[PDB]
Amino acid sequence: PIDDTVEGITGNLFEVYLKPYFLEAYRPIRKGDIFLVRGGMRAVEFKVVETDPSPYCIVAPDTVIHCEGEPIKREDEEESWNEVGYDDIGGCRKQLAQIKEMVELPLRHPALFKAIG
């Protein structure tokens, strides 16, 4: 688990979050993946630190899931827990599209504006 995302939770996280997430879903996963699971009026994050076979596999009914060890530090990883994104915004598609266009070049391609007047 990623430490900040399980603070204030107690109990069996595996049974509550990981089992339903993977159950008969045959999810493909890769070593180094960070994934988000929702339930219980919160969201928790986990990191895939190893797989066998390596470095990716399908999590199948026979797959054993190990969860023992030192929790991951959220500051050491790139993830979106509790960060708002466009997926958190409903019912103003056209206004958001306008704003996206307005900021695309200055925020995503800033070097452009030392080339052009």
Ligand X SMILES: Nc1ncnc2c1ncn2[C@@H]1O[C@H](COP(=O)(O)OP(=O)(O)O)[C@@H](O)[C@H]1O
Ligand Y SMILES: NC[C@@H](O)c1ccc(Br)cc1
Size of the site for ligand X (CB under 6 A): 5
Under the criterion CB under 6 A, does residue 50 sit at the interface with ligand Y?
yes
Q: How far is CA 20 from CA 17, 46, 53, in A?
A: 6, 14, 22
Binds 86: which of ligand Y, Na ion, a copy of itself, none (CB < 5-8 Å by kind)? none
Rounded Cα gap, residues 57 and 62, in angstroms = 12
Tell whether the torsion through CA atoms of 35, 39, 44 and 47 is positive or negative: negative
Region of 1-9, 12-20, 61-69, 83-91 interacting with ligand Y (CB under 6 A):
61-69
Instruction: Estimate to the nearest angstrom the gap between the alpha carbon of 10 and the chain centroid.
Output: 21
Region of 1-9, 65-73, 74-82, 108-116 interacting with ligand Y (CB under 6 A):
65-73
Residue closer to Na ion (CB basis): 62 or 87 = 87
